[PDB]
Amino acid sequence: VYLDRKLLTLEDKELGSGTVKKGYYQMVVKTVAVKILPALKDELLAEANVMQQLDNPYIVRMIGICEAESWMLVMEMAELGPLNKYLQQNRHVKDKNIIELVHQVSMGMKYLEESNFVHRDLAARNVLLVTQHYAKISDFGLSKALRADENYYKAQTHGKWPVKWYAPECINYYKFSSKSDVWSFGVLMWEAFSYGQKPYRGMKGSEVTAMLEKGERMGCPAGCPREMYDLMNLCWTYDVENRPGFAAVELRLRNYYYDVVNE
Numbered sequence: 001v002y003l004d005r006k007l008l009t010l011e012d013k014e015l016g017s018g019t020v021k022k023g024y025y026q027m028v029v030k031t032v033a034v035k036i037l038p039a040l041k042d043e044l045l046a047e048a049n050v051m052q053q054l055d056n057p058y059i060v061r062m063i064g065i066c067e068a069e070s071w072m073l074v075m076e077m078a079e080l081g082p083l084n085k086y087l088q089q090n091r092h093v094k095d096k097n098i099i100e101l102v103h104q105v106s107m108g109m110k111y112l113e114e115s116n117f118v119h120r121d122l123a124a125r126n127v128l129l130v131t132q133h134y135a136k137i138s139d140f141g142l143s144k145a146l147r148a149d150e151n152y153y154k155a156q157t158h159g160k161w162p163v164k165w166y167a168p169e170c171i172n173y174y175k176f177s178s179k180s181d182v183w184s185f186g187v188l189m190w191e192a193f194s195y196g197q198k199p200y201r202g203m204k205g206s207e208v209t210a211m212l213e214k215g216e217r218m219g220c221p222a223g224c225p226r227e228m229y230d231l232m233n234l235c236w237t238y239d240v241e242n243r244p245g246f247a248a249v250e251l252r253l254r255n256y257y258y259d260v261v262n263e
C-alpha cells in the first residue's frame with residue numbers, strides 16, 4: 001500500500017494539472033501515473049482506500065501511496081489519456097470502436113455496481129485509454145462505498161459538482177446510487193458519440209435542470225446509431241426506480257456490439 005520512494009522515478013514533463021506526472025516504479029519497471037498533492041490529504045487517502053478494494057480490468061488500478069515532498073497516489077498508466085480529448089483529436093475513430101469502448105466502461109460500471117460503490121464523477125474526461133481498443137474508468141475522488149443497509153449515498157453540502165452529468169435525484173435530493181451513475185453514463189455515451197464534445201453546450205446548470213424537467217433531452221449525435229441513442233435516453237429516465245441498472249445497460253451494449261461485429 002505504502003510504496004518505497006527510492007523505487008519511484010518521477011518525470012519532469014507533467015501530464016496535466018494538483019498535478020499528475022508520469023513515472024516508473026521498480027518492481028521490471030512499471031510505467032505509472034502519479035497524482036501529486038489536511039482535507040486534500042484526507043481526500044487522497046479516502047480515494048486510495050476506494051481503489052484498494054476494486055479489482056477489474058476496466059478500472060484504473062492503484063499501485064500505492066508515497067509520502068515524500070508531497071503526498072503521491074501512484075496508479076497504472078493509461079498512455080493514450082482521456083477519452084474526450086482522444087476523440088477530439090481522432091475524429092475518424094469508427095462507430096464500432098466507440099461502441100467497444102463505451103461497452104468496456106459499462107462492464108467496469110457493472111462491476112462497481114455489483115461491488116456497491118458509487119462513482120459520482122462518471123464523464124468522458126475520466127475514462128482513460130490504455131489503447132484505442134481498451135478503456136479504463138479513472139478518478140475515484142468523489143466515490144463512496146455504500147453502507148450495507150442503504151442503496152444510496154446522501155451528500156450533505158453540494159460542493160464542486162459536475163451538474164451536467166448528474167441525475168435529477170442528485171440535484172434535487174442529494175442522493176447518489178448506482179442508477180445515478182447510469183444517468184452519468186448516458187451523458188458519457190453522448191460525449192463519446194459526439195467525439196468528445198461538451199454536453200448541453202452554452203447552457204447554465206440551472207438551464208439544464210429546467211430542460212430536463214420539461215422532458216427534453218440532448219439530440220442524437222451525427223452518425224450515432226439509433227440503438228445507442230435509444231440506450232442514452234433509457235439511461236436518462238427521470239424516475240430512478242424505472243431507470244435501468246448497469247446489468248441491464250451492459251447487456252444491451254454487449255448484444256449490440258456483437259451484432260455490429262457480425263455485420
Ligand SMILES: CS(=O)(=O)Nc1cccc(-c2cnc(N)c(C(=O)NCC3CCNCC3)n2)c1
Nearest residue numbers: 015016017020033075076077078081126138139
Ligand atoms: C487528465 S490529466 O491527468 O490532466 N492528463 C493526462 C494525460 C495523459 C495521461 C493521463 C493519465 C494516464 N494514466 C492515469 N492513471 C491517469 C490518472 O489517473 N489521472 C488522474 C486524472 C484522471 C482524469 N481527471 C483528473 C484526474 N492519467 C493523464
